[PDB]
Amino acid sequence: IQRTPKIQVYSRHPAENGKSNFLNCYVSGFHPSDIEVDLLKNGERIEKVEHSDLSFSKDWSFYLLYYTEFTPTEKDEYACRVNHVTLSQPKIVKWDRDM
Amino acid sequence: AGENVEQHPSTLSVQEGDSAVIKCTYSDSASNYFPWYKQELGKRPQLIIDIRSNVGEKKDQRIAVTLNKTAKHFSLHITETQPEDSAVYFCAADGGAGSYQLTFGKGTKLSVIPNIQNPDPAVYQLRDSKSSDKSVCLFTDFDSQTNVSQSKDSDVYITDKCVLDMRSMDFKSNSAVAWSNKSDFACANAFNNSIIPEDTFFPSP
Amino acid sequence: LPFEKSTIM
Amino acid sequence: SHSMRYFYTAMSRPGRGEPRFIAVGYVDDTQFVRFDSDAASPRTEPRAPWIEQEGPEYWDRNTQIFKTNTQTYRESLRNLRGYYNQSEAGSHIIQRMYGCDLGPDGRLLRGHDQSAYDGKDYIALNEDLSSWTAADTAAQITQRKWEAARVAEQLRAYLEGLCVEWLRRYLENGKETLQRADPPKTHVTHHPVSDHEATLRCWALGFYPAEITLTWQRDGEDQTQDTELVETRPAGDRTFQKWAAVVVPSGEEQRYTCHVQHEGLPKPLTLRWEP
Amino acid sequence: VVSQHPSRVICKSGTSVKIECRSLDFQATTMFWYRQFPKQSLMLMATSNEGSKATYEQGVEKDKFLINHASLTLSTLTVTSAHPEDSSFYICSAGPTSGRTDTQYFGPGTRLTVLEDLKNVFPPEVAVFEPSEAEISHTQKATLVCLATGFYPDHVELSWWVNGKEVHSGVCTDPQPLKEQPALNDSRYALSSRLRVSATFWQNPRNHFRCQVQFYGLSENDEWTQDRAKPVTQIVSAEAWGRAD
């Protein structure tokens, strides 16, 4: 009846400082379908963020990919802020280039 | 809108016990549902059998349906035809673009002429149960070869040939009724030499 | 190409 | 092996008005179509370049059926609300997945048609393509209606016919991108958590299809319980990514070996920490 | 199953007739309306859509036939300001599956008869003629003949009731009536029927035979200025009992 979203923050290509890449936030395993997702640069919301079309897995849980074109640096911190009914407070997952 | 269903033949006559086959052709490959409807006069069309694109043949007692999806045609096969099979048959397909609908064939008027084993043609005068002053003529027990012709005299009335099935003792019999309001009318005026066979039992009233 | 028929549950 | 699937999501929204119908289509792990009823004049849209080859009559054909499903699912949602004695104030979801799987010969290997209500199994078509499996008695009411409407017969005709024929057409139109297998680019990384224990991570990158096997071993022995596997994720360019991690005690790094299994690889690769 | 109401209508020109089409045991988002002339074929007129406007076929007057999809179970056909040329058999169909049309279930049909003058309506005179002694001796069978005469329009259904229950075996009725005067448009019709039993069955006077003629005529609402009896929807019967000799 209800499932909490699984979050993965990663890059399309292996992260290289100064080289343009894509910041991906894969939100999966949630139910019902309504979800609010934000990509963050140093705690601030990125405006130009796009998402994949709503689909679901064999267990009926939904999956979405929120992505943006980005330039990773050594010190800039990137994250994904997710809100769903199963979440009392917005969940924030930081981006780890080695995960 | 992009679907055209053609039914061949438009009319068909068959002998009781023989087989009848109606052939339908279609145009669209989106056609996957092929129903067959039977309509008796003044009544609603009834679904008798249907076939789908994944099936080549489907049988049910004396009724069978065959489909050839490559050539885009399908047929109804009725074996051991009975006079009760006499009705208008329609075929359909669900293909085509635009507005959703079944595209029907124009129809097939099927006629199953009964097989009369022991014909004993006769002309009887039947009297009324209430008044007994006026009567009617019954030409009956004639074989299916006999053609009952309408009279030239407007004052005299003749009905078409009609077959009844006495299921209890495997008997079937044809009959036609004649009458007139004229005092001078006799049975021979309606059921004469041109209509009735030479072996007709014609007793005096 | 999708399935072209739907039946109310 | 190849497959085609349609995923439908119908949601009731009591505050917002009328129910919303979404449909997405997939050929293997590639999405090619989408429809969303939530527009003034909704239309089917392409989502893969190899489907833009189809003319306007195809887009109208898809739009006409998805508009019918919008209407149909509004009633299914109303009906299912009745079966479960649910309030009209609550938002509910019907989901459906159906499609065909082909073998190496362009023939139907297996047909599918499953439905769910509020994230749980509801009714599913059986492998015979003629009978149903209902989850509860509410699904048995739907089953009665669907048997009377001969829905299994309609599905069998489609899955055996138009489903395999169109999947074959799509496979030929997108041959260079659908009948291509992208092997993964593999490498092993080392990350210390303490002075005497470090995590070894095996990476699988830029692969298509999504189907992949990643397994950690101790001198040729499976580490099933200790291996941490992350869910296969999309790179966003139609390729996939996956990694497997193991907490390895300091010194035993050369002992651990990882194994990668993928369609694009002719021989399953064995990897170890370098240097 | 799918039903219709009314099954038979006799109205004066200019009147509007509303015909119902109902799916009795399923929900229908679509219903199809057909017209059947003496030319046996099913001619599709319009497609009733919930809750959008009707889809009319080529050569169909939108203003003559108003189609309305009232609910998931009811569709109505309205023949506005009817004229004798609008007289036909109107039949509908519906099915539980939406989208590309699947199994369709037809209603019983509605026979609409539009007359310029309602004074021409007449009920039938029903008579039963008992079997010929010559036939009994010759074949050991006893054919009973029924005759309905002087009715207008062709809105008559005949049945044979032996010993209180309806009979079908050894029965044959004229598929269509015959015109009493084949020259005028308003000509009264005549219909005949036959029932064949064994000689021993007719001889037993405990056995009862009844020819039932259900006639569909004018409704209660119709106004009748003439002194002769109102030709209302009724049953005219003629009976006979077993004869021993």
Side-chain angles (χ1 to χ4, degrees):
Chain A
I1 57 113
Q2 241 160 47
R3 285 191 269 235
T4 208
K6 319 221 211 112
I7 307 150
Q8 289 204 75
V9 201
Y10 55 106
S11 63
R12 185 181 296 182
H13 305 282
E16 285 179 286
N17 300 138
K19 287 188 187 80
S20 206
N21 212 322
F22 281 92
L23 182 67
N24 292 329
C25 183
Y26 184 57
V27 283
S28 61
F30 61 100
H31 215 291
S33 78
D34 290 342
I35 199 155
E36 292 180 278
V37 173
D38 292 292
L39 254 19
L40 304 173
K41 184 189 181 179
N42 300 313
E44 290 155 62
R45 201 244 272 98
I46 301 159
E47 247 83 88
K48 283 175 260 188
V49 173
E50 270 180 282
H51 57 272
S52 67
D53 294 327
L54 187 87
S55 197
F56 50 85
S57 314
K58 289 190 175 196
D59 74 334
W60 307 106
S61 64
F62 299 101
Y63 64 83
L64 283 178
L65 179 73
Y66 281 79
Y67 62 94
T68 188
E69 55 296 326
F70 91 127
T71 292
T73 67
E74 208 188 301
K75 297 284 161 183
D76 285 312
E77 40 260 322
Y78 292 93
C80 194
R81 193 216 288 140
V82 180
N83 207 19
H84 191 246
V85 273
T86 62
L87 300 164
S88 54
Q89 74 290 282
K91 189 170 162 69
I92 304 158
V93 182
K94 278 178 74 74
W95 168 58
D96 191 318
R97 63 210 288 144
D98 289 299
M99 268 181 80
Chain B
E3 186 50 270
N4 175 71
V5 180
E6 278 179 64
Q7 201 166 340
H8 318 288
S10 179
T11 50
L12 188 74
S13 294
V14 85
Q15 196 70 65
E16 183 202 347
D18 293 343
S19 293
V21 178
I22 305 157
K23 197 188 186 181
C24 285
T25 54
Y26 63 95
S27 325
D28 214 291
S29 51
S31 280
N32 292 170
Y33 182 58
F34 306 96
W36 281 92
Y37 289 87
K38 183 187 168 194
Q39 183 179 44
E40 300 180 334
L41 215 134
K43 291 169 183 180
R44 80 177 86 200
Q46 302 273 32
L47 178 85
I48 48 143
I49 205 156
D50 55 45
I51 202 168
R52 298 185 187 267
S53 58
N54 68 302
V55 188
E57 196 191 81
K58 188 162 147 181
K59 201 198 75 64
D60 172 39
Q61 311 283 288
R62 291 156 44 240
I63 291 115
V65 55
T66 298
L67 172 78
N68 181 343
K69 59 174 185 183
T70 308
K72 291 185 178 74
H73 75 74
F74 66 106
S75 310
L76 216 205
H77 310 266
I78 310 154
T79 55
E80 308 172 307
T81 51
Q82 295 172 13
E84 304 84 66
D85 301 348
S86 305
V88 183
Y89 287 86
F90 298 96
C91 71
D94 71 334
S99 207
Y100 291 134
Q101 57 187 64
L102 278 179
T103 305
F104 283 90
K106 291 280 114 193
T108 300
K109 176 68 206 172
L110 180 77
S111 294
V112 184
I113 47 162
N115 178 70
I116 318 296
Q117 291 138 65
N118 303 86
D120 184 51
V123 181
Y124 307 115
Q125 201 182 66
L126 270 92
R127 218 94 179 185
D128 194 70
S129 70
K130 297 183 259 79
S131 175
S132 187
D133 208 58
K134 225 179 221 78
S135 63
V136 293
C137 322
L138 179 82
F139 175 35
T140 180
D141 299 48
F142 56 93
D143 48 283
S144 293
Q145 145 78 70
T146 304
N147 299 309
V148 175
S149 296
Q150 201 60 240
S151 185
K152 205 192 172 289
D153 184 23
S154 67
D155 296 292
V156 314
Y157 307 101
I158 307 163
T159 73
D160 190 37
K161 52 191 168 176
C162 201
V163 60
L164 50 89
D165 201 305
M166 284 178 83
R167 225 193 77 190
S168 46
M169 216 67 187
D170 295 71
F171 188 76
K172 287 162 278 289
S173 88
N174 290 311
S175 45
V177 175
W179 73 94
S180 189
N181 289 104
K182 298 212 299 300
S183 51
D184 58 292
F185 180 74
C187 308
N189 288 318
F191 306 118
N192 48 49
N193 295 333
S194 70
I195 298 155
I196 69 164
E198 279 169 53
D199 59 316
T200 307
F201 169 66
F202 218 139
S204 57
Chain C
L1 186 78
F3 181 42
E4 284 172 297
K5 297 162 189 284
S6 62
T7 305
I8 295 164
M9 295 167 78
Chain D
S1 292
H2 297 288
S3 69
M4 178 159 78
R5 299 279 192 273
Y6 284 85
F7 299 78
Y8 294 174
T9 309
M11 325 154 192
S12 78
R13 39 196 191 169
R16 164 122 248 218
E18 219 76 272
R20 183 175 173 186
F21 180 80
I22 296 162
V24 295
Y26 281 85
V27 164
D28 304 324
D29 299 304
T30 319
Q31 190 204 344
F32 68 102
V33 282
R34 68 141 183 234
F35 178 92
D36 206 324
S37 71
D38 217 20
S41 192
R43 280 201 305 172
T44 317
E45 284 157 29
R47 295 293 278 157
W50 51 261
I51 200 71
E52 292 160 16
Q53 282 176 243
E54 304 293 327
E57 214 170 286
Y58 171 86
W59 299 108
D60 287 348
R61 200 185 169 165
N62 274 253
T63 299
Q64 196 184 342
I65 189 54
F66 300 144
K67 284 187 175 184
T68 292
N69 289 293
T70 303
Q71 164 195 252
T72 272
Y73 275 108
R74 184 191 65 232
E75 300 308 332
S76 298
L77 282 154
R78 192 163 298 139
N79 290 356
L80 264 70
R81 194 174 59 77
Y83 304 165
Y84 292 113
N85 202 56
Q86 288 161 341
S87 175
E88 54 254 340
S91 167
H92 298 279
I93 298 174
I94 299 168
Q95 282 158 272
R96 184 202 191 176
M97 184 229 71
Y98 71 82
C100 50
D101 291 338
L102 48 83
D105 58 293
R107 231 158 46 98
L108 185 72
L109 188 61
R110 200 191 166 130
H112 311 265
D113 180 62
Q114 301 189 278
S115 283
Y117 187 59
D118 291 334
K120 291 172 87 180
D121 286 342
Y122 186 76
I123 198 170
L125 185 67
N126 292 332
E127 217 178 317
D128 61 20
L129 313 181
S130 41
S131 61
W132 306 91
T133 298
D136 55 17
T137 60
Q140 285 183 311
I141 297 171
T142 301
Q143 191 186 332
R144 200 183 151 87
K145 294 183 186 182
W146 279 11
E147 280 169 333
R150 306 202 312 272
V151 176
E153 263 189 48
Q154 300 167 22
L155 279 154
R156 189 164 181 186
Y158 161 80
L159 297 160
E160 284 182 23
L162 295 171
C163 192
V164 299
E165 291 159 8
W166 282 79
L167 170 54
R168 283 194 261 117
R169 164 176 186 146
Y170 301 154
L171 283 167
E172 191 50 57
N173 292 4
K175 200 166 89 176
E176 290 298 286
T177 193
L178 297 168
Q179 296 190 248
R180 121 274 186 186
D182 273 34
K185 287 157 92 176
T186 51
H187 69 102
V188 187
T189 57
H190 182 272
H191 305 101
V193 71
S194 92
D195 298 330
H196 293 96
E197 60 201 295
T199 58
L200 275 169
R201 195 160 281 131
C202 188
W203 291 83
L205 305 155
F207 59 93
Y208 182 95
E211 199 58 72
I212 202 154
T213 318
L214 261 294
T215 40
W216 270 116
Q217 282 195 327
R218 265 237 281 179
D219 305 306
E221 203 78 82
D222 357 302
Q223 213 78 357
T224 57
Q225 192 67 73
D226 313 279
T227 309
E228 188 220 334
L229 277 129
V230 95
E231 195 213 326
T232 304
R233 63 206 196 179
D237 59 354
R238 290 175 180 105
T239 66
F240 298 90
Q241 305 180 348
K242 207 196 185 71
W243 58 253
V246 280
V247 181
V248 175
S250 292
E252 286 146 293
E253 276 114 66
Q254 296 293 285
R255 180 195 254 267
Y256 284 75
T257 47
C258 206
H259 301 265
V260 194
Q261 288 162 271
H262 193 272
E263 191 185 288
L265 297 163
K267 173 249 173 188
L269 287 166
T270 304
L271 283 104
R272 56 180 76 94
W273 165 247
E274 289 173 70
Chain E
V1 97
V2 164
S3 204
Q4 284 177 244
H5 182 264
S7 60
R8 278 158 208 92
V9 195
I10 293 150
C11 69
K12 190 195 169 74
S13 296
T15 67
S16 281
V17 62
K18 198 186 184 176
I19 304 164
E20 289 167 24
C21 180
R22 186 86 71 157
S23 53
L24 304 183
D25 70 346
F26 64 92
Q27 289 185 294
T29 54
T30 326
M31 305 209 186
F32 303 87
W33 284 101
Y34 296 92
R35 192 167 45 192
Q36 216 150 31
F37 296 95
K39 240 263 193 288
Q40 318 283 260
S41 74
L42 286 158
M43 183 199 281
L44 183 67
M45 286 191 290
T47 298
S48 196
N49 311 296
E50 192 279 340
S52 179
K53 60 261 264 76
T55 309
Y56 290 94
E57 285 304 285
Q58 288 170 31
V60 178
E61 291 188 286
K62 140 82 223 167
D63 298 284
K64 250 274 156 66
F65 308 104
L66 312 180
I67 277 88
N68 174 51
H69 210 97
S71 61
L72 273 307
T73 210
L74 177 67
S75 178
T76 67
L77 204 211
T78 302
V79 192
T80 58
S81 65
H83 300 305
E85 49 264 39
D86 303 307
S87 298
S88 199
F89 180 79
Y90 296 90
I91 194 161
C92 77
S93 91
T97 297
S98 307
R100 207 164 277 282
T101 322
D102 211 67
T103 322
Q104 288 293 124
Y105 300 95
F106 287 83
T110 302
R111 180 92 81 88
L112 170 70
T113 300
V114 192
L115 302 158
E116 207 65 45
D117 178 38
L118 241 56
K119 287 190 272 289
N120 310 117
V121 185
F122 290 96
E125 286 191 71
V126 187
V128 164
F129 301 79
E130 65 170 84
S132 175
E133 73 296 286
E135 185 199 348
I136 290 139
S137 61
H138 214 256
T139 54
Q140 296 308 305
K141 286 146 205 289
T143 306
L144 290 104
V145 298
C146 187
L147 200 82
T149 342
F151 60 94
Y152 190 80
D154 176 29
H155 278 235
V156 142
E157 42 171 79
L158 204 150
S159 54
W160 283 107
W161 298 70
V162 176
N163 298 316
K165 95 267 162 190
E166 199 183 341
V167 144
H168 301 281
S169 193
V171 163
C172 85
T173 319
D174 300 340
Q176 60 208 84
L178 56 87
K179 281 197 170 187
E180 279 177 16
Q181 192 202 89
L184 221 141
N185 81 93
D186 166 52
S187 295
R188 284 174 235 182
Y189 297 88
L191 191 87
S192 82
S193 198
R194 299 138 300 255
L195 156 73
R196 204 169 213 187
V197 294
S198 65
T200 50
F201 199 89
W202 166 256
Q203 278 141 356
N204 173 353
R206 293 200 179 268
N207 289 321
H208 179 61
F209 306 93
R210 196 174 61 94
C211 172
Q212 195 174 271
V213 174
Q214 171 78 81
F215 171 72
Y216 291 86
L218 309 176
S219 195
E220 310 96 88
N221 56 77
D222 293 288
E223 210 166 288
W224 196 251
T225 56
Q226 288 178 303
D227 206 271
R228 82 271 283 253
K230 298 183 185 180
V232 289
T233 313
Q234 64 149 314
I235 292 160
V236 188
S237 302
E239 58 161 59
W241 248 289
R243 287 277 289 261
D245 64 310

